[PDB]
Design a binder for this molecule. Sequence first.
Ligand code: BCL
Ligand code: BCL
Ligand code: BCL
Ligand code: BPH
Ligand code: SPO
Ligand code: FE
Lengths: 281, 240, 302
Amino acid sequence: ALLSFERKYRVPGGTLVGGNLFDFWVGPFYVGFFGVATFFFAALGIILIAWSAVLQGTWNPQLISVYPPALEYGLGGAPLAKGGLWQIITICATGAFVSWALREVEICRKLGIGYHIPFAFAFAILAYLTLVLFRPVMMGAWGYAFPYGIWTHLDWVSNTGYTYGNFHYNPAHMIAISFFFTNALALALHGALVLSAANPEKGKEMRTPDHEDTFFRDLVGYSIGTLGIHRLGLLLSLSAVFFSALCMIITGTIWFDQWVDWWQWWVKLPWWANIPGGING
Amino acid sequence: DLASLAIYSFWIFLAGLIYYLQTENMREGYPLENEDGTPAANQGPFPLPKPKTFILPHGRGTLTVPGPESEDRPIALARTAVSEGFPHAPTGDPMKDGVGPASWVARRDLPELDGHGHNKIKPMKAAAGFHVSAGKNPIGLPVRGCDLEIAGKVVDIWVDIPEQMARFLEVELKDGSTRLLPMQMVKVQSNRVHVNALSSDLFAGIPTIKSPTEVTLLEEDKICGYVAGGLMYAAPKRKS
Amino acid sequence: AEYQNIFSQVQVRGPADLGMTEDVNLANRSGVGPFSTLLGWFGNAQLGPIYLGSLGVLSLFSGLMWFFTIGIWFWYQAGWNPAVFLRDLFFFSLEPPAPEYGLSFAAPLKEGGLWLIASFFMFVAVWSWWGRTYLRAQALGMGKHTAWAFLSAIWLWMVLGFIRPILMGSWSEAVPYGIFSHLDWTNNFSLVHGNLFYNPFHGLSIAFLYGSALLFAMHGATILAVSRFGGERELEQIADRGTAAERAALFWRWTMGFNATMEGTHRWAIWMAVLVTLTGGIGILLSGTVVDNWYVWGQNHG
Ligand code: BCL
Ligand code: BCL
Ligand code: BCL
Ligand SMILES: CC[C@H]1c2cc3[nH]c4c(c3C)C(=O)[C@H](C(=O)OC)c4c3nc(cc4[nH]c(cc(n2)[C@@H]1C)c(C(C)=O)c4C)[C@@H](C)[C@@H]3CCC(=O)OC/C=C(\C)CCC[C@@H](C)CCC[C@@H](C)CCCC(C)C
Ligand SMILES: COC(C)(C)C/C=C/C(C)=C/C=C/C(C)=C/C=C/C(C)=C\C=C\C=C(C)\C=C\C=C(/C)CC/C=C(\C)CCC=C(C)C
Ligand SMILES: [Fe+3]
C-alpha cells in the first residue's frame, strides 16, 4: 500500500470541497470529492456505452461506436438511439475530465507542489471540447462532432480533413504539426542527455549538468539548460495542442473553402501578382 | 506474411520494453510497505530489478539501488483511523516537524558540487564576476509575508554557478540573522518582494544553515520543505 | 499573481562558461559567442562556444552544399527574378529522376541529377553530424544515448529517401525537396497505398507522437511544479533522492496509481520519443515493398 518514503506526506488537508469527508486513499489512489465525481461520471458513461453497445448489436470493441445526432437535429436533443446517448456520454466525458483535473488540484495542495500538471491537462480538455462542443456549436450541429469508436473516429478524421482538400494546407495545422515534431525532438534529446550523464561511459563516474551543458554547446553552439528544457517541453507540448484547437476552431467556421486556396493571398499581392516566370506566372 | 510477422513481433518487443521500463522505476520506494513500515503483503506483478551502482564523482562514493530503505528521521504523525488508507495527523507543529507539505528528506549534509568540485551555489557576494544582469534586482527590497507585514530585507542572492541562475534570496530579520527563501516561492515587484507561502511571524522559524557561504542538500531540503509547507499551514494568517 | 517559474524574474550573469575539458581537444572549441538577455528570460543567456573538428567542418560544409543546391534550382525555377522567388518560395520544388531512369545516375542534371547531387550532400551532412553526435559524447565520457536516439530519426529519413527507393527499384519513389511538394508527396503517398490509417505501424507512430506530447507535458509540468525544491537538478536527485523527487512520484501515484523514479522517467522519455520514428520507418519500409494497399492487407491481416 505505501511507498517507502510515502507516510510522511499522507497528512490531512488540501481538499477543495467536502473538508475531511472524502479525504482518504484507496490502495495508491487519492480519492477526491472529485475522485467521487470522476467515478460517478466515468462509471455512468461507461454503463451508457455498454448500453448503446447492445442497442447497436455488438460486444466487440473494434465495432462498438456511438454517433452524434445527425445534422438534421441541429443543436437540439435527439432520441437515445439516434444520437442522444452520445449527447449524454459527452456530458459524462467532460464531467469526468474536469473532475480529474480538479482532483489533481487537490493532490497538488496536499503535496505543497504547484499547479502546472492540471493546468497542462487543461489544454487537452480544451482540445477535446473544441472537437465536440465549441466547433459543433459554432457550426450549428452536434453532428459535426466525432463519434466514439476506435476505428470509426479516424473515419471522421479523414472525412473532415478531406472536406478541405489536403488538410496539410491549413496554416495553423502546419504550425501545430511543427510543435508536435519539435516536441518529440526535445523529448528524445532531453531523455538521452540526462541518461548519458547518469549512465556514463563505464567504470566511469557519473557526469554533471556541467557535462550536459558542455556536450550541448559542443554539438550546436548552445545549451538551454536544465530549468530551460523543462520550461521548453511544457511550451512545445501545450503550443502543439493550442494550435491543434486553433486549426480546428477556424475550419468550417471562418474558413470553409479548400485550404490550398487560402495561400493565394500571398501569391496575388500587387507588387508581384503579374510578374511572369516561376510557378505562378 | 512479413508485415504480419513485424507487427506481431513488435507487440512482443513492446510488452518486454513496458516490463523492463516498469521494473527500472522500482529502484526507489520499493518494496512497498504498510502504514506501519513493514513490507506490504502484495507487491504487484513486477519483481525488483538486479541492483545498479552509480559512481559519484568527487570521491563522494556510491549509490546502489534498489537497496535497504529508510527515512533517516523521526516522523511526527499518528494514524487517525482504525484501518489502512486514511490521513495521519501531525502530532506536533507540522512545520517545525517537517511533515506533510513541509516534509524534507534526509539528503547528504554536504553541498552539491559543480563539475569541477566547487560548491554549486554561493551567495553572489562571494561569487567572482557574478552580478544581476536583467530584470528588477531584489537586493535591498523589503520582504513581505502573506499577512501583509514586513519580515525582513533581501541582502543577497544565492546563485547557481554553473547554470548562472538565481536560486535563493538571503533575507535578514529584526534579529540581524538571515534565512534563505527559494527563488521560486517569491514574487519580486517594484517596491518589495512578496512571499505568499509565509506569514511575517513564520520567518524566524525557517531552517537555518551552518556556514554562511554554503548550503548542504540536507539544509536545502529542510528550507524548501518548510516554506512550501506554509501554503497549507499558514492559511490561518493569509489575507486577500 | 502567485509565481510560476515560467520565465525568470531575475537574470544573473557570471564569467563565460568554457565548460568541462575532458578528452576534448580544446584546439577545436571556438571561444564564447555573446549573451542574449532575451534567451535568458527563458533558458540560458550564453551563446557558444561550439566545437568544430574536421568531421565538424565536413558535415557543416555539405550541409550548406545541399542547401545551396536546392537554392540555385529555386532561383532558376524563378528565372533569376528576386520578387518571383519570394512569391513562389513554397512552390519551387527540386524533384527526383523520372521512373524510367530507375536507380541509375544517368538522368540529366536538369531532370533529376541536381536532385541526387543535393541528396548526396544531405547524406554526408547527416551521417557526419551523426558520428559528430557520438564523438562529442566520447570525448566527455558520457553514455551513447544521444547517438542511439538520433539513429531513430535517421532510420525514417533513411527509409524515406534511400532504403525504400532502392528496394522499390527507382529514385522517383523518393521525396522532392520543397515546402508544398513534400506535403503533396505525403498526401499522395498515403492515397497510393490504401490510406495509411490502415497501416498498423502508422497508427502506432501516432500513439507515440501524441504520447510524447502527453509525456513531456506531464514531465515538464511535474518538474516546474517541484522546482521549488530544486527538482530541475535531476542528476543529483538521481544520486540522492530529495523531497522534489518524492513529491513528484507521489503526485503520479495518487493520481493514476503507479509512478516513476527521477531516473526512470527519462527512460520513458527516450523511448516514447524514439519509438515515433522507429515504428514510422518500419511502416514506410513495408509500403509497396511488401503491402501495396494497407486497407487490403488490413482486411485479412496475414
Ligand atoms: C486525412 C487527414 C488529414 C488531417 C486532418 C485532421 C483533422 C480533421 C484533425 C487533425 C488534427 C491534428 N492533426 Mg492533421 N490531418 C492530416 C495530416 C496530419 C499529419 C501528417 C503527418 O500527415 C500530422 C502529423 C497531423 C497532425 C495533427 C495535429 C496538429 C492534430 C492532432 C493532435 C490533437 O489535436 O490533439 C488534441 C488531443 C486530444 C483532442 C485528446 C484529448 C484527451 C482528453 C482531454 C482526455 C481523454 C482521456 C481518455 C478518455 C482516458 C481513457 C481511459 C485511460 C486510457 C485509462 N495531421 C491529413 C492531411 N488533422 C486534429 C486537431 O487539430 O484537433 C484539434 C483534428 O481534429
Ligand atoms: C487527436 C485528433 C483526433 C484523433 C486522431 C487519432 C488518430 C489519427 C489515431 C488515433 C489513435 C488513437 N486515438 Mg484518437 N483522435 C482524437 C481523439 C481521441 C480521443 C479523445 C477522448 O478525444 C481518444 C480517447 C482517442 C484515442 C485514441 C486511441 C484509440 C489510439 C491511440 C491514441 C494515443 O496513443 O494517444 C496518446 C496517449 C497515450 C499513449 C495514453 C494512452 C491512451 C489510451 C490507449 C487510450 C484508450 C482510449 C480507450 C480505448 C477509449 C475507451 C473508453 C474507456 C473505457 C472510457 N483519440 C481526435 C478526434 N487518434 C491511433 C489509432 O491507432 O487509431 C485506432 C491513430 O492512428
Ligand atoms: C494525407 C496524409 C496521410 C499521412 C501520411 C503520412 C506519411 C506518408 C508519413 C506519415 C508519417 C507520420 N504521420 Mg501520418 N498521414 C496522415 C495523417 C496523420 C495524422 C492525422 C490523420 O491526424 C497524424 C497525427 C499523423 C502523424 C504522423 C506521424 C506519427 C508520422 C511522422 C513521424 C515523425 O516524427 O516525422 C518527423 C521526422 C522525420 C521525417 C525524421 C527526420 C530526421 C532527419 C535526419 C533530419 C534531417 C534534418 C535536415 C538536415 C534539415 C536541417 C535544418 C536545421 C535547422 C539545421 N499522420 C494522412 C493519413 N504520415 C511518417 C511515418 O512514418 O508514417 C509511417 C510518413 O512517412
Ligand atoms: C498538453 C496536451 C497533451 C496532454 C497532456 C496531459 N494529458 C493528461 C495530463 C496531461 C498534463 C494529465 O494529468 C492526465 C493524466 O492523469 O495523465 C496520466 C492526462 C490524461 N490524458 C489521457 C489521455 C489522452 N491524452 C492525449 C493528449 C494529450 N494530453 C496532449 C497531446 C490523448 C491523445 C493525444 O489522443 C489521449 C488519448 C489520460 C491518460 C489522462 C486523463 C485520464 C482521465 O481524465 O481519467 C478520467 C476518465 C476516465 C478514467 C474514464 C473515461 C470517461 C468516460 C466518459 C468514457 C468515454 C469518453 C469518450 C470520449 C470515449 C472516446 C472513444 C475513443 C476511441 C476516441
Ligand atoms: C536566399 O537564397 C539562397 C541563395 C541563400 C538559397 C536559399 C535556399 C532555400 C530557402 C532553400 C530551401 C530548401 C528546402 C525548402 C528544403 C526542404 C526539404 C524538405 C522539405 C524535405 C526533405 C525530405 C528529405 C528526405 C526524406 C531525403 C533523404 C535522403 C537520403 C537517404 C540520401 C539519398 C541518397 C543519394 C541521393 C545517393 C548518393 C550516395 C551513394 C552512397 C550512392
Ligand atoms: Fe527531466
